């Protein structure tokens, strides 16, 4: 949108440095998981930049000039998560998100894990209802499908057919 | 306007299906609502239901016109404002100032747990410096509405 368009020509000038871009824009996932990254991911959306310094001179950018608001999120901050990313455990060997995702930017990687966290990805809702519902962790778990249970335990779908509209 | 599918199977039971959340609560005072609308938001029209398998058979048999998020009462399971954290808000504002929001409603005992999970998690406040006060208290770190329908959330 007219956002990220203002944001990505500050970076191409030069004029604000530090900028990355949208999240989503920064790594790659096997088409097949598309509609599941996409339904359960709104932080794909999100606009890295290296530091707190960086984000804030956007968000003074955008609103000087009424184009409008945008996330940001800053490589400084995503540090913690350096010791956090090794796979784990997960019911039926459900595929993580997180670990679907294909980066070479390891500061990157870091603001990927930030945004998928422990999010899993299953075949259909019968597995997702399955994984998700343990007793001793419940699972943040969206389908190929786009439907999603969330750690709250609601699910939501519908309309999937429309999911390809023009 | 009430909550419309197909049956997902034959011999189905209605009663399985509680409808939609907005239809299914009772404002104790009508000078809340406006809090109480901004408290649940889109939640009002998450449809509540008996289980998981229930929420499963309407998503893909129920022909639904939306996208729907379903509350199943088998499973939800929110993450409730403690004792403690009411405790520490009504010493702060005083208890006449704060509310859980979920007090502020009535609704049919078998939905508890839905209900939970819609009002059990935000304070409602009965003004802004008491909102602010209560949501950003380093001990109760919670969302809090206003009467006037001002959102203050920490996170």
Known sequence: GKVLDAIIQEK?????????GRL????????????????????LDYIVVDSIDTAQECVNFLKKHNIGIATFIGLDKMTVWAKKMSKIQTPENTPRLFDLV?????????????????????????QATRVAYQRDRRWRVVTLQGQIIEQSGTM???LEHHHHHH | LQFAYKDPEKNWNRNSVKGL????????????????EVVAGERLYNVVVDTEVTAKKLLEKGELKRRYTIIPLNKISARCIAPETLRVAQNLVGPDNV???????????????????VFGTTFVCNNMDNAKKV????????????????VFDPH
């Open chain 1, 12 to 20: 191409k000038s030069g004029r604000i440095p530090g900028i990355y």
């Open chain 1, 24 to 43: 989503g824009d920064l790594g790659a996932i096997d088409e097949k998981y598309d509609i599941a990254i996409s339904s359960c991911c709104h932080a």
């Open chain 1, 102 to 126: 294909k980066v070479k930017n390891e500061e990157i990687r870091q603001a990927f894990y930030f945004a998928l966290r422990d999010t899993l990805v299953a075949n259909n809702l019968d």
């Open chain 1, 156 to 158: 939501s779908g519908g």
């Open chain 2, 21 to 36: 959340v907005a239809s299914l609560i009772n404002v104790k005072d009508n000078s809340t609502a406006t809090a109480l």
């Open chain 2, 99 to 117: 509310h859980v929001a979920l007090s502020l409603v009535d609704y049919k005992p078998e939905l508890q747990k839905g209900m939970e999970f």
């Open chain 2, 135 to 150: 949501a950003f208290d380093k001990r109760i770190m919670t969302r809090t509405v206003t009467l006037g329908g001002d």
